[model samples]
Each structure stands twice: as structure tokens, then as C-alpha cells.
Target chain A: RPGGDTIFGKIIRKEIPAKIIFEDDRCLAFHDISPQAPTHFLVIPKKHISQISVAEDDDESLLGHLMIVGKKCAADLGLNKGYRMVVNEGSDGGQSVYHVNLHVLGGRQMHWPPG
Target chain B: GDTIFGKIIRKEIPAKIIFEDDRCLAFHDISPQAPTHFLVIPKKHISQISVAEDDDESLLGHLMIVGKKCAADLGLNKGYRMVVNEGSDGGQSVYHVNLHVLGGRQMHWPPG
Candidate 1:
């Protein structure tokens, strides 16, 4: 309930316009402004939860919902051929957004040694 | 069209072997971020961690188990970090459903 500020919060409130590709009762998926891959989308929850640091196993529902929404968005993006997904937590690993969001990246060849 | 990782998953390319099972595959990241940086992928072809279903429950569990096994297999019997990036906001560069297992080096929290 603390640290209420969130990027997805602004998106959820419609404060910023996103090229929304998918939406349902629990989550929303949209294209990432800065594309890492050919198909890059951000799947976020309507709720303003922090990164995975604030998550627990009990939060399985939210986790599952996020994954399913990501899949739907990936399919919409026509990445049935291949894709890559990731979540960066905290700051040591490059988590710019405090709000927990799932990255659906695909559309071209993905490499290892992610930098 | 021929990203090294792309070829690895499709068997079109070859990666240094780490671990492999029927439902999951683990391989070393060519350019590792840590002492042990590898990606674990499920064969089912789920695009994102958020897209997983109940039917995938067993497979998901297996992924974790396999990850741990891989870590141990790689002499990371002490401790390691496992990460699943959800969206671009989360710093996910790939869309394929996979888990990142990091060990050997000290992993700091609040990852930047």
C-alpha cells in the first residue's frame, strides 16, 4: 500500500496514451515505446503494484494473469514463430519502471548476454 | 534472422550444453551477465510468463526444479538468482517465455 507512484499507474489512469494492443478485465498489453526487439510490448496490471520485489508466491493469480495476457498480446503481434519475455527487478538489473510489468519481446532473432 | 539464441532454441544453432529435459531446456548465455547466466525455456512455446495456464502448472514447477538442478549441476550449489521479466517496463528484451538463472557473482537486489 506504500510507494503509490507508478508508470503503469499513469497509463491505467489514461494520463498517457499508449498503443494498446490488448486489454481485459485484469490486465493491459501495449507496445514499448523503445523497441528492444521487432515486437516489444508491455503487459501491466490495472493495480499499482511495485516490482516483483513486493511479490510473493500467494500472488500466483496476478502472476498467471500477467502471463496469459502476455501470450495473447504475443499472438496478436504475430510472434507465433518465436519471441522472448523478461522481467527486470530492482535497480541492479535495470528496472527503470517501478511498476511491475511483463515485457513481451519478439519479432526478430533474440540474442544472449542481454545488455 | 539468425540470432544466436534464435538458432539455439530451434536447434538451427548450437549452444554450450547446460541442461535439457522433455519440457524445459537450460543453456548458458553466450554473453553471461553473471558467473552463471543462463536462460531456461519451456518447450510448450508460451510467449510470456503471464501467458502460462493451469495446464502449464506442472511444467512451470518443473522449470523451477530444472533451474535449480542446472544451478547445482554448474557448481552453483551455494546460492543464485532466478528472474522472469514480464514486460518492457520490466526490462524484458525477449518475448519467449523463459527464466534467467544467475549465480556465481553476488546478485544485488533492487536490480538496476
Candidate 2:
């Protein structure tokens, strides 16, 4: 994992403080510093896989676990109307963080033409 | 899953298939969202992420990897966006739990 040391790495290592909302053995979920929606948070793995496009077969369970965790957090947040689970990759995807993070956005109407 | 994707999975309707496995399928979206837009969906009939059972955790995980692998296979290395829409507010036009993989342009924020 040559590139595991990203901002998320710091949060995972406790080197930085975050508004952590959920944590477990596989991943951690927290509120995004920059909120895009009324409800916005990120779920990232403890083990850095860089990004989703680089993910391997071995990372399947961990990746799926991230979604499951996000869903639970959304439920707890009362995002019953619905929520958007987003993962941005490299430049085109606008993935500022090298460490893969799953974004959960809700608490308001989500539009189309997602950019 | 068979709502509409099921028909695609069964080849009941034609789709520009990209990748497939025992667990899931990847193909182009009829209405592309970006330069490169496709979908990676579970063959299983889970309607959406919020309703997925714990037993399907591993399968759910496979969907993510598939989304990434498929995007890479399409030469979207610069980057891509993977998304799962849940219910109405999530803009889930189709029900059968699917992951949207889109790239070829720098996506903007307030992603909806």
C-alpha cells in the first residue's frame, strides 16, 4: 500500500480529529467537512485501496461492507426519503482524496445529471 | 432485480454488455450520463441498497469491485464516479440495485 497515507489515513490513524459518526473493524464513517447536501458523510476503509478502479478481488467484502455501513448510517440519520451513495475516482471523477471514500448524501431532494 | 435489469440479465432485452459473472452484470446505460456511463448491477433481486440483507454483504461488495474493474477496462483510468441511488430522492429510475459508473469528464459537486 504505497499510497495509503492520505487524509483519510490520518483520520484512521487518529492523527487528526473528525466528526466521526460511525466506526467498526472494517471502515469508518464521518461527516464531510464541506457539506453538499443537508445530510452528507463519508465511509472509508481502514485499509487504503486508493480508489475503486484500483480495487482487486480481495477487496470485494470490504467494498460491500462500506455500502452496508453507509446504509445503516443513513437509516439512523432518518434518510428514509432516500440517499445517494457516490464514489468519485481520479480527476474526471473529482476524487480529491486518494483513499477511497463512499459518500452518502441525503436529507433533501437529490437531482439528476449528477456531475 | 428482474424488474427491468432482470430482463436485461436474462437477455430478454438487448444491452450493450460490458462484463458479466455469476454474481452480477455490467453494461452501457441506455441513456449515457457522461462520455462514459455504464452500470454494474447484481443479478440478485435486491431492489435497492437500503433493503439489502446482511447475507448479501459479500455480493454487495463484489458490485463495487466490478464497477471499478469495468471502468478501468473501459480506459477510464483518469477517474470515474460510482454511484448507487436509493428510492425517489436518490433518483433511482430503475429499482434492481445497480451501481452507476460515469467518467470522461470532471464531475461537478452537489452531486445529485
Candidate 3:
């Protein structure tokens, strides 16, 4: 279990419950347990890549593809107005989870300074 | 980064430059959102991530990596938030497409 120790791994394995909203061969999407806005979800890769900094050049396609998938996730939720993708880099960024998860937030007027 | 940001890249409009290279430019946001607020933008104008072609995959990945290095250079050891806004609701005023690197504070949840 420690091999894929991250909580996201459990989510990926269906070991835990999540309101999964989207899924593909490469990744998965689900609703945030704690909704920051009317529309909040996370897009994570099927493979366990730690964070952006840990990602190497080989992950180029997958990395950008994640953004495209996140965009699809937002559109699927009817966030035609707009949306924001946030990536927590490390402890200072308040990254509770170590997995490289893209947070898709929208469905309202997002304020400045993005607290 | 948009018209004003474009001018900044062209050096037509002055900005607080932080990091620079042949591929992209890093500069402080005129309106700082956090104690450490800067932007990493590609030299090539891609407009937005939604419209980014598949060929831009490498460059896109490059942007993410650079954001991390940029943060580290500033000693954001605690961590940092890398954000990309899309469309109008995404709070993206700049059309040229850029990654916003924000840190130097405890970033909260819901990140709107």
C-alpha cells in the first residue's frame, strides 16, 4: 500500500469514495469534498506524479493534457463563464496532498489576490 | 499577460522584471495579489490554455517547471501556488496566456 501511498492512489484504486465526475484512460476527475465554490473539482493523473517540480521532461504531453482534461471537466459542469486552475507546489502553497492534482474552481465571480 | 503585458514583453511597457530567458519572461504583477506575486509567460503568444495546440505541449510543460524554479529562486521554501485563469469567469484579464505564481503566504482553500 505504501507503494502508492498517496490518498489519490486510494481514490484511483476505488479504495475510498469520491464523487468522481470524469474519467479517461489517462486521468480522473471528481468533486471536492469541500466545495470552495459552486463548482469545484480536482483533475488527477492515473499515474502517480508527485508535483509539478518533480515532473520531468518525459511528462510533457501528460502534463499539458491534464490541463486540457481539466478544461473539459469545467465545461462538462457548464462553467461557460470561466474557471481557474490552481496547482499547489509545496508546503507554502498549502498542499495538503502530495499528489499532483489540478484544482478546477469556478461558477462565480472569483475575487482578486485569490486567497 | 495581454496588451499591457505584451508591451512588457516587448519592453515597450516597463514592468518589475524578476526572471528572464530566451523562452519566456518572469515579472512582478503591477498589482500584487500576495506577498510574492509574479507571472511566468511564454515568449510565444498562445492566447489561452484552452486554445493551446497539441504542439504546445512541451512549452506548456516548460511553463509549469519554470514556475517552480522561479518560486524556488525567490526562496518560497514553504510552498507556492501556481494558477492559470481561463475565460472571463476564470478571472483572466490577460489574453496572451501566462501562469501566475503566488506565494509568501498561507494559500487558502477554494482558491477562487
Q: What level of docking quality does candidate 2 show?
A: high
> For residues B17-47, what per-residue lDDT tens digits would candidate 2 score against the true structure?
9999998999999999899999998888899
Give the alpha carbon lDDT tens digit for every residue of A9-60 in model 2: 8898887799999998889999999999999999998987877777889888
lDDT of 1 by residue, A29-105 (tens): 88888887767888887766666545545455665577666776776667765555556544444667878777777
Sliding window of 10 residues with minimal summed lDDT for model 3 chain A: A1-10
> How many Å off is the CA of A92 in candidate 1?
1.8
Q: In angstroms, what RMSD does candidate 3 have relative to the true structure?
A: 2.2
Candidate 3 docking class: medium
Q: State the lDDT at B72 in candidate 3.
A: 81
Error of 1 at B107 (Å): 11
Candidate 1 backbone overlaps, count: 34
Ranking by DockQ: 2, 3, 1
Query: For model 1, what is the alpha-carbon lDDT of residue B70?
Result: 78
Q: What is the DockQ of each candidate?
A: 0.13, 0.84, 0.66
TM-score of 3: 0.90
Clash numbers, per candidate: 34, 4, 2
Q: What is the TM-score of chain A alone in each candidate?
A: 0.89, 0.95, 0.93
Off by over 4 Å in 2: A1-4
